[PDB]
Amino acid sequence: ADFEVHMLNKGKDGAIVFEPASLKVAPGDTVTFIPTDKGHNVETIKGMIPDGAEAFKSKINENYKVTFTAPGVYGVKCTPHYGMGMVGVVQVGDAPANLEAVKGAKNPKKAQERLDAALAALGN
């Protein structure tokens, strides 16, 4: 199945968001990051992908389709808006095995709050 994640200047959760900011998918699902508002991209947060997963980094304003396979949690960011909170989490499968690695990482406050909220939304 394919899911869109919109890259927004503002959304349901306020300024500079991925919407949704949390999404649970199955292996083989795709997530298409939509540049609905200009100036955004999506990138995995280094240290926040599961064992053996490929990192990814899109271009600014690129419509970017990712196929998620390895189970676990994937922390994502928008590079230009990372520190002020434009982050999210894609979870592949149940009981993500890399959860503690993701939780333990340091981030700027606004990014951390949004990562933590996404992890909690996903039942972690």
As measured in angstroms, the least distance from the Cβ of 47 to Cu ion is: 20
Cα torsion angle, 84, 14, 65, 121, sign = positive
Could you give the CA distance from residue 118 to residue 68 in angstroms, rounded to a whole number? 18
- 81 binding Cu ion? (CB under 5 A): yes
- 77 binding Cu ion? (CB under 5 A): no
- 40 binding Cu ion? (CB under 5 A): yes
Binder of Cu ion out of 78, 87, 115, 119 (CB under 5 A): 78
7 is in an annotated binding site: no
CB nearer Cu ion, residue 81 or residue 114: 81
Cis (ω within 30 of 0) for the bond into 20?
yes
Residue 110's H or E segment, with its range, is: helix 109-121
Could you give the CA distance from residue 92 to residue 70 in angstroms, rounded to a whole number? 7
- 86 binding Cu ion? (CB under 5 A): yes
Residues in the annotated binding site for Cu cation: 40, 78, 81, 86
Q: Which residues contact Cu ion (rule: CB under 5 A)?
A: 40, 78, 81, 86
